[PDB]
Amino acid sequence: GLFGAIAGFIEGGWQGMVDGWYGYHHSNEQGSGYAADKESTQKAIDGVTNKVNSIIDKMNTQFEAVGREFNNLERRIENLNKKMEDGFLDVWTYNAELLVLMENERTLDFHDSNVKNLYDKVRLQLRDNAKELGNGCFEFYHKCDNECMESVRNGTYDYPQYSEEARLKREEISSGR
Amino acid sequence: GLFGAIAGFIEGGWQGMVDGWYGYHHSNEQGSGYAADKESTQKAIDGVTNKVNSIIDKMNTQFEAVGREFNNLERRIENLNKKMEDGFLDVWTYNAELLVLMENERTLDFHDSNVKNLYDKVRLQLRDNAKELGNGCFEFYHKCDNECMESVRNGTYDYPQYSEEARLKREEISSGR
Amino acid sequence: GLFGAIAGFIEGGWQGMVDGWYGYHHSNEQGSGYAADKESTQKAIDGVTNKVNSIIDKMNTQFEAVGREFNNLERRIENLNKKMEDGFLDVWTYNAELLVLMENERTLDFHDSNVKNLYDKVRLQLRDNAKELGNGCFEFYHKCDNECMESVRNGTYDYPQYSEEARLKREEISSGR
Amino acid sequence: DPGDQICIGYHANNSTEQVDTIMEKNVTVTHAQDILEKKHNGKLCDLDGVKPLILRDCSVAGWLLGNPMCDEFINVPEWSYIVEKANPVNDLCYPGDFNDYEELKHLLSRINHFEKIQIIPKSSWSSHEASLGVSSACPYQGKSSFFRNVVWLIKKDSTYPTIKRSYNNTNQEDLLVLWGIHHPNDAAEQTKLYQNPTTYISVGTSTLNQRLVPRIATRSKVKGLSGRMEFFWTILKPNDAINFESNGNFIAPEYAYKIVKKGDSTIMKSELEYGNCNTKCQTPMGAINSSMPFHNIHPLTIGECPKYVKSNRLVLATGLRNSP
Amino acid sequence: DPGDQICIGYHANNSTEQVDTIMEKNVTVTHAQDILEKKHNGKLCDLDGVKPLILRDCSVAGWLLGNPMCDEFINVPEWSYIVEKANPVNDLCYPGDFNDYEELKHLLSRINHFEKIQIIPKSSWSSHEASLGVSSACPYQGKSSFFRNVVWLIKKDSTYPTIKRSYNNTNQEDLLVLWGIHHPNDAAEQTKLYQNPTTYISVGTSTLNQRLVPRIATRSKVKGLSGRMEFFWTILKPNDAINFESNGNFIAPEYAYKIVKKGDSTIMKSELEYGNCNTKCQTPMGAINSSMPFHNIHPLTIGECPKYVKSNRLVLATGLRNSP
Amino acid sequence: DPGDQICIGYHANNSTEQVDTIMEKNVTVTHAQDILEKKHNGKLCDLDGVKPLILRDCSVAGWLLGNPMCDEFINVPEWSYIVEKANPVNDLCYPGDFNDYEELKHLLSRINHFEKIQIIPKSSWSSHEASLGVSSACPYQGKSSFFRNVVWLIKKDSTYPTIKRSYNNTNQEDLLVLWGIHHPNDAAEQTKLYQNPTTYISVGTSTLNQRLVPRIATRSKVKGLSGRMEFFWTILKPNDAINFESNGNFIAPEYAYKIVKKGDSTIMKSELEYGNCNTKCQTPMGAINSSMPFHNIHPLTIGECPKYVKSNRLVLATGLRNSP
Ligand SMILES: *[C@@H]1O[C@H](CO)[C@@H](O[C@@H]2O[C@H](CO)[C@@H](O[C@@H]3O[C@H](CO)[C@@H](O)[C@H](O)[C@@H]3O)[C@H](O)[C@H]2NC(C)=O)[C@H](O)[C@H]1NC(C)=O
Ligand SMILES: *[C@@H]1O[C@H](CO)[C@@H](O[C@@H]2O[C@H](CO)[C@@H](O[C@@H]3O[C@H](CO)[C@@H](O)[C@H](O)[C@@H]3O)[C@H](O)[C@H]2NC(C)=O)[C@H](O)[C@H]1NC(C)=O
Ligand SMILES: *[C@@H]1O[C@H](CO)[C@@H](O[C@@H]2O[C@H](CO)[C@@H](O[C@@H]3O[C@H](CO)[C@@H](O)[C@H](O)[C@@H]3O)[C@H](O)[C@H]2NC(C)=O)[C@H](O)[C@H]1NC(C)=O
Ligand SMILES: *[C@@H]1O[C@H](CO)[C@@H](O[C@@H]2O[C@H](CO)[C@@H](O)[C@H](O)[C@H]2NC(C)=O)[C@H](O)[C@H]1NC(C)=O
Ligand SMILES: *[C@@H]1O[C@H](CO)[C@@H](O[C@@H]2O[C@H](CO)[C@@H](O)[C@H](O)[C@H]2NC(C)=O)[C@H](O)[C@H]1NC(C)=O
Ligand SMILES: *[C@@H]1O[C@H](CO)[C@@H](O[C@@H]2O[C@H](CO)[C@@H](O)[C@H](O)[C@H]2NC(C)=O)[C@H](O)[C@H]1NC(C)=O
């Protein structure tokens, strides 16, 4: 996809997040698990349901074929008649197919732009208190329990609070020992 | 938005930047103020004016209904005539509404993609001479007055010149005093 | 473009990279040269070729004008006939012109989204084993020959293998000689 | 040693739905939504409440004039839409022409009910022979007969005195009225049937001004006959009167039609017969019962229906891309 | 202590303009652009310079043929477009028909001006009665009268001698000519009025070859009358001649029309009357004065106009999204 | 000191192809693809194998009826499509009228070949004068002549006894048959040419029932003549018989046409003449030889063609944005 997240730096999706489209996998001393991002999954549901209704709704009025019968010396407008009704049947078929196709692309790059936007939400919260691994995961320079994992999830995460324990643990790895 | 800048990592827009769409708010030793980015505001005016004229111009020629009148035994082609002019009126209604709908979304991600792209104009100019806060702001590791802030604006910002003072203040904060 | 790469952080493209759309320009002790990325160049070709065919294919059937003749006192329905066949010629002219215009934009920002995304495949492989120069280039913290450069190209790049020599070279430049 | 970790990822599952895109075909995704209805039930149904008028081997013309072979339709109930086959067998049994017939079929598309009424009593033809007017072109059951709603008058004794008959539509609805002229083969035939050699049929309304004359000619045999019948029609406005005067070759009316419920209807060309069901959507191919916004069964549908398109596939992508 | 800082941001203001998008409705943005004009002035105007021809309670048939009640229109100025009500009262005062009338109206849509000319002087009728041709269906003001541009000839003394009359178009422009035939109620009326019992009307052009005959029939009374008038019309080419011959039942012309300026025009159906204003765009419901590319007033417009669409709203997004 | 480097970049070259986008015009790119075919060869060609039927200064009417000047077309080869000029010179040489001529032209667009056949031999006219039917309007080369496929009969000695003639289509294909009526200038002329003053033409089929009567009037001279010819036509179904009876003013047939190969065809309006080439795609402006999906030559094309659009330019962008 256009934003390089889906089938990109996060290669593969998680079979186990059965309660959302986008989300988290926390991992501390207490254990690990799946937690779905509550708000962005809803933000995508609304954009897609609004889109689906807008496509059906746009084809609200559309050409309606009518039966007309013409006699033997009315051959000309008989034909005029036909090329016309067909004429219109074609225009609206082109419009339906080409619209679905176009908004299929835009549906996918919405999901893609969203994953890449949740990853950069976390990235600018933590900064150097964690190490960016490159596979879409973050490894902390400090100790983070389950109510701390929650502070990153709902956006509460406090940087100055853990920043001292992180910068002293960064200093330990600079030395090598 | 698709690029995560507008209503994203920069939460809120500035009531006080009244002379451009995108811009800066510096804050150094001498004080602070607003200064708008010169090319991207113009890069956007051109993109919007071209689109507005492109939509108006595409619809410049479009079906025009004409009055035709038929008698008591021309019931069929009377009806043929009606459904035809109606048919076309509907196609062009649809072609119009749907073009705006579509280019409105795309209008917004031009504005969004422009903000996020200007933030990375500065991020790859300063690099490690300043600290990325995550709220869309940079805090310098060196001293930067008013003709130095100007060099970041127009792209003149000199890295090797300040990299000495910054790498020494990075050393001061690594120890923790 | 929307993703800020082409005519963005890589100001200018390489006149000399003839065997592809996107690629690399390496520089070690053994020398320098051009190497085109084979999989991203090939995936973009498939995406453009499918688009060119979808466009020609959608205009598969579209209105075909027919000759009809009417006499001196069939003036009325004669006009019905002109305005119909003109009408349809207009619908399809608009549809062709506007589809190209729209899909021209999405073609350029596909190339733009791809360049920036290949730059992030490399940046997330090196991390702190290399310094981001900001001009779209990387300057290594270790010694990397041709069998090492190739491992970044095809995605093989080994971080822990070079990370020791790198963290000692980061520490030496921290000192300032 | 592993330091604590947090990861960002997206949904995946066991879905094999495929969509298409401007650049990629058959992309498998997490969730999809089809909007095209492709299935119908192959039958002709009632429409909500209403059973369609299904002419079997009859035509609209055969019905209205009353072809003997059409008796199944002598007094129909109210309908929802008429179904006529593409090439009906029992049309004008005695060969000729039904004037402005397509335009009439057009009127029928907005009519839901008739009421046959007598406007000139067959017994009333006291000084002519109503009862000889019968042809082998027009056979009941090997019995040769005639159209039922019209009457082929013939000379009585030796003479055919001038007919003057009129009927004043005193109902509050419109009256569809039909009549016709008979064109013989030669002078000999003319004088045998009607005695008077030079003849006419005049017909007046507040809007009609018609004077018909027989057209003697030598013609190919059609159904063994060389003569022809030509039928005509009008809407007789409420409180208006129609007056017939004739002199020979007159096919007079007896029964007429009061247009007595108007509304949506169509004439549906279809080979099918009555399917004993019910829909809210009918097609000349079979009925549809669906919530889909789109179908591709047949462009000419009646009732509350999805919009016709010509595609064999319209599927939306709603969910997200499924793992490579 | 704050170390030096720099931030990047975007514009905001006090604007509550809302646009729409395929995925999101009523999105409030910094700047908007409406492209649909929705207001007009409920009045019928001049079009640039020119005042429209407004037939009031007149029809096009009534004007040209010369209804007594239509005298206001005896010599119209050059117009910009004609306006006719949906069912005008002053049509054919004496009941009958205007032949090929819809097509004639068609020509009018490209004609901006006539110039009435006399082509057969009423005084020239020396051996017939020009002045008995008068009817109670055709009332001037209680004085019973007739159409003005034609003349209903009647027998003089006891007889109606054969008419042979002609006019050669020596003008450089085309000539619209009108005439007609009268259909009596019975042989008696025919012979009272024209003496001759069997009659005809022949009409020749370089292209016309017409021979009409009165069509006696017993009919409904319309406006108290049972007889009918049927009117006909032709274009007489420059330097071509028209020739009438008749024998009874002739409605002769006196005046013709030269098509003298052609151009853009329409016959516009509207109930309205003259609004004493002026525009560059007119609608049967009012004039539009606008810079917008689009309007939603009424699809049948004349003049320099925005393009009709059916929308309630067409608004573009130009600025960026405004803060929550 | 330079530490080792790796850089990411993209293609550029010296292409000056420019494309457009909704927001930006004349954008220079790396690779482009034109999809609009804009050039044709200005000529009228054969279509795959077949040479079009090109009437030069003829009309379809003049051909099928046999205008002497149209003799170039007495026996045509099979065609792919007919080309007719906008205003052919040799139409109906003796002035008059062609019934339903436009509908007949409509049939021709699906006919690729006729076979002229004799259906009533000019020599068979034993008791009338076949050979006097000749006019100064109908010049062979200064020799005044007539249409070739019909025959203008005349009284012989002093009389014109009643014609009764018939032809039975014993072929398997359909038969286009033509005939006509002669409208003289006065009673004097009528009796000079045909003796009988009261005359008629009857024509009977399994489906025709026509009795035409000459229509006397005094008319403009057209090409020195005031009289008129009015022509008529039918399709005679296989195994059907047509019978003419007349009495005067009859323009009889000699040759009829069997419809012998049907298929795609058009009547192409064009001024052009035969261009001696060949294509798979023909336009009244010239032939097209192209692979493009789109052309902008002319909307009326016949044969294997790209789809018409009205664009001046249609170009896709395929490569990437090119360096300043
Ligand atoms: C067919 O029968 C209808 C229905 O009865 C007849 O309509 C009626 O005609 C009489 C004339 O004999 C009208 O009487 C008139 O009444 C009005 C006011 O009521 C007045 O203006 C007149 O002076 C006259 O006395 C009567 O209105 C009318 N009925 C209706 C419902 O309009 C008619 O006579 C018959 N039609 C024909 C063509 O014979
Ligand atoms: C109606 O009257 C007009 C009067 O303008 C007549 O038109 C004229 O017709 C005469 C023939 O009688 C033409 O005279 C001729 O001159 C031409 C050369 O111009 C020559 O070829 C002939 O030998 C003849 O002498 C004359 O051209 C024409 N006038 C104009 C202005 O074109 C005509 O007689 C009447 N039209 C009809 C249809 O009766
Ligand atoms: C024009 O000529 C055609 C072709 O010769 C004629 O058609 C033939 O008509 C005869 C009757 O005269 C038919 O013979 C009959 O056969 C039927 C069944 O086929 C049988 O039921 C009868 O006893 C009768 O003897 C013959 O079938 C028919 N030929 C074809 C090929 O159909 C006909 O006489 C002429 N058509 C017209 C309209 O004048
Ligand atoms: C889309 O998936 C189907 C998988 O079968 C293919 O579509 C077509 O369907 C038949 C059988 O249903 C396949 O055998 C053919 O490949 C297709 N038919 C034709 C006439 O082309 C197809 O393989 C897939 N499309 C793409 C572009 O991969
Ligand atoms: C979009 O905003 C409008 C403005 O209120 C809403 O449309 C309707 O507006 C009328 C008054 O114009 C109100 O009475 C209603 O609130 C609306 N009617 C209906 C039937 O909804 C509309 O609610 C807004 N749309 C969305 C999706 O928020
Ligand atoms: C688009 O590019 C072409 C490049 O020339 C321009 O198109 C026009 O054609 C002539 C010569 O081909 C140019 O010199 C003119 O500038 C153009 N004519 C007109 C009437 O504008 C044009 O410059 C470019 N389009 C725009 C809008 O600048």
Side-chain angles (χ1 to χ4, degrees), chain D residues 220-221, chain F residues 168-170 239-241:
Chain D
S220 299
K221 286 186 182 162
Chain F
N168 177 334
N169 179 1
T170 63
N239 273 323
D240 198 10

Side-chain angles (χ1 to χ4, degrees), chain D residues 34-306:
Chain D
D34 190 340
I35 45 166
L36 184 61
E37 171 62 40
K38 315 174 197 58
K39 12 169 94 288
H40 68 92
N41 81 357
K43 294 178 177 181
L44 295 184
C45 306
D46 295 13
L47 203 36
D48 294 76
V50 201
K51 185 212 208 284
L53 166 53
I54 287 164
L55 320 152
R56 214 184 279 93
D57 296 314
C58 280
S59 62
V60 175
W63 166 35
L64 299 186
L65 288 116
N67 197 319
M69 297 273 84
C70 291
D71 274 354
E72 122 144 76
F73 303 104
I74 282 168
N75 268 330
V76 300
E78 164 193 335
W79 60 87
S80 39
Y81 62 97
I82 309 158
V83 182
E84 198 194 42
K85 291 179 160 43
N87 297 296
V89 176
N90 308 330
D91 198 82
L92 302 181
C93 68
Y94 193 119
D97 286 292
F98 193 110
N99 205 84
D100 277 335
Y101 182 54
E102 292 70 34
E103 281 271 300
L104 170 75
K105 273 161 158 255
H106 186 254
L107 262 20
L108 255 188
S109 61
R110 291 214 62 73
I111 284 185
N112 288 126
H113 199 204
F114 283 136
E115 187 192 301
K116 207 205 225 77
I117 68 180
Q118 162 168 269
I119 66 162
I120 320 164
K122 193 161 104 145
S123 54
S124 62
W125 304 104
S126 82
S127 43
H128 307 71
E129 279 279 345
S131 292
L132 297 187
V134 157
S135 181
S136 53
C138 283
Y140 185 23
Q141 14 199 242
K143 187 63 161 150
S144 60
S145 211
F146 198 65
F147 304 94
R148 299 202 208 284
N149 310 331
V150 302
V151 181
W152 190 9
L153 303 173
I154 266 87
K155 81 206 207 190
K156 189 181 248 170
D157 298 319
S158 274
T159 66
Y160 186 130
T162 306
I163 293 176
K164 291 176 195 119
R165 273 349 182 70
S166 85
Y167 167 88
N168 178 352
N169 179 22
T170 66
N171 306 272
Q172 283 161 243
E173 39 272 315
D174 281 311
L175 252 189
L176 164 58
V177 184
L178 311 171
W179 68 107
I181 180 164
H182 170 239
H183 301 304
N185 288 317
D186 58 59
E189 178 174 347
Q190 164 70 26
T191 182
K192 169 171 180 180
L193 295 220
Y194 318 117
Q195 180 80 11
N196 320 319
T198 329
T199 61
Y200 63 104
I201 304 169
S202 87
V203 177
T205 285
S206 69
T207 145
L208 208 46
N209 185 350
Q210 174 186 111
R211 177 137 163 162
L212 306 177
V213 219
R215 259 153 42 207
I216 298 174
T218 292
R219 321 163 191 94
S220 299
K221 286 186 182 162
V222 185
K223 281 189 174 176
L225 297 180
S226 274
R228 302 292 191 263
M229 224 67 92
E230 173 167 20
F231 289 101
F232 292 108
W233 63 272
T234 203
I235 305 314
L236 186 52
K237 280 287 168 196
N239 271 324
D240 192 15
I242 187 163
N243 319 263
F244 306 85
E245 176 171 13
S246 194
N247 175 223
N249 312 71
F250 185 34
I251 279 74
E254 182 174 7
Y255 301 77
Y257 297 79
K258 311 208 302 174
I259 294 149
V260 129
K261 149 66 150 330
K262 288 179 164 145
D264 293 348
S265 152
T266 138
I267 286 193
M268 215 173 59
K269 288 283 163 175
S270 188
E271 299 319 291
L272 292 157
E273 329 160 15
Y274 184 41
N276 295 96
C277 42
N278 174 23
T279 8
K280 296 194 174 178
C281 182
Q282 182 74 60
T283 278
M285 285 294 60
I288 293 166
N289 177 27
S290 185
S291 304
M292 307 283 205
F294 290 126
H295 81 88
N296 72 17
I297 320 306
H298 192 286
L300 294 167
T301 81
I302 171 164
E304 198 189 346
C305 293

